[PDB]
């Protein structure tokens, strides 16, 4: 019986930023965040506010706040995240 153990693997990474799309939540920024995509009745469908920053990238407020728990760096550009608007 043949059994595979090692899988020495290479995968190229690139950029896939489609326009007006939540980069973390992998959907439109105007829609609900992936945390709010499930159990939509629990959410009020408003707290997914379009965040902004000096990096000039738009996400829902649940994205970066969840992201800030892991690292304090913007995902698209490897610099520290800020809030500039609402």
């Amino acid at each position: 019986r043949f059994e595979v153990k090692k899988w020495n693997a290479v995968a190229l990474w690139a950029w896939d930023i489609v326009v007006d799309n939540c980069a973390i939540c992998r959907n439109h920024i105007m829609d609900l965040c992936i945390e709010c995509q499930a159990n939509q009745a629990s959410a009020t469908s408003e707290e997914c506010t379009v965040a902004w920053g000096v990096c000039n990238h738009a996400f829902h407020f649940h994205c970066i706040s969840r992201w800030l728990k892991t690292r304090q760096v913007c995902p698209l550009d490897n610099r520290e995240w800020e809030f500039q608007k609402y």
Binding site: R1, F2, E3, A9, V10, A11, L76
Partner: protein
Amino acid sequence: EEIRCRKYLHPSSYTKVIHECQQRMVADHLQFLHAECHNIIRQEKKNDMANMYVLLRAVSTGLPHMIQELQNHIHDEGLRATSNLTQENMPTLFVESVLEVHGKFVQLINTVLNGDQHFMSALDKALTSVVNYREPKSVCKAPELLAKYCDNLLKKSAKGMTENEVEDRLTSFITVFKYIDDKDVFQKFYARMLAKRLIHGLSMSMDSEEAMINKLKQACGYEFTSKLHRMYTDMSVSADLNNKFNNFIKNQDTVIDLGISFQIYVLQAGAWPLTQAPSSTFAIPQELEKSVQMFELFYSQHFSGRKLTWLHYLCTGEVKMNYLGKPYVAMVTTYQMAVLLAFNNSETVSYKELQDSTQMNEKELTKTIKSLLDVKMINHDSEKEDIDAESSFSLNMNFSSKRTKFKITTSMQKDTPQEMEQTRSAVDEDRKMYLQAAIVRIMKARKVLRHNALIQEVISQSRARFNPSISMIKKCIEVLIDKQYIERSQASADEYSYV
């Protein structure tokens, strides 16, 4: 004469006396010294040449002829030391042959020729054509030769030269690289050789590659090694990436079963020379299917907006061939790894049985069995052992080699001329890309130039990159005509204008 002049004349007359002295003994006899000036360099009479050099230094028109005579002789000396190079150890010989010529001539110019800059510049001009020994109606192999020479020393070797030995060897290698006139050709070739030294781990040491890259950056600026430095950065951080993903498995609610822990080598597609040349829709195994999705799901957690392109033609691994008297371990590429799952599924297998298994192209499918029939791991049960539409075979149990570990190595670390010609064409494509940039920018300055002035300065501007062909440049105007960017003048094709 000066000692005579010191004890008699005023100090203000010291220069005029000895200048008119040289005006009547080495300026009148300038042609007489020029007679054996060719002979005195060919014979390389050291002390005689210096006395000739000292007198010719004072002559306002006595040195440049001597500069040319040394330049031709160094050109004559350099060609002789590179013609008789053997075909076997050519990359080691060619670099050392230039260094032997360059080393003694630097030793010649610095010691007995008083280290004159023009004589040093004469060596730079003469040796530049020597190292670029382009045979007529052919291509210069020097960028590939320096690529091979750097790759030969950078691989781990059975001889195993010491770590400190490479650094002094590489320092002299930069001096040869300073005269190559085809730095872009070396860049693409070295990038591919850096790849085969990085994915397969076939490198002398990690810091040796960093030292080698940094020395290149000290020689051709930063934009020349930016892609290579990005390759080194990704290959170095990839150790932390696999540990970071291993934390993600422990960070999951449920345990996930898979093969060994991943050793993924995520590389930046923008700068790496790897390209999705094959278009085969190679399916991953069902055993391996959930393994990919877990890493893909993880990659969206710790990165964002990435959308990996899963390279497969450089993906390798192992498999346990549990059919023999004792367990065997073999390093296997993933193209030949997936077709082995057919053997575990059913010993009887045809060519069309693999069509609905891997969904790969017929050339890569042929290469998998071609890498299996020569190693006698499998046995082609058909009467004819060549390729055919049926291709009925099974597992050759006769393989009982004493080695407990053996790779299934394909033609990696070899240089097939098909992709090298593509890479050479890709270099020429990069040559065309930069040539158009200089042409419009030159037109962006004055908007009216003649053909000769436009041609000449692009050679000067791109001298540090390559030697652009005039026909190659003339194509770039035609493309900008087609793209309505440049406009030659109707009154004279010599002049050019703006669209």
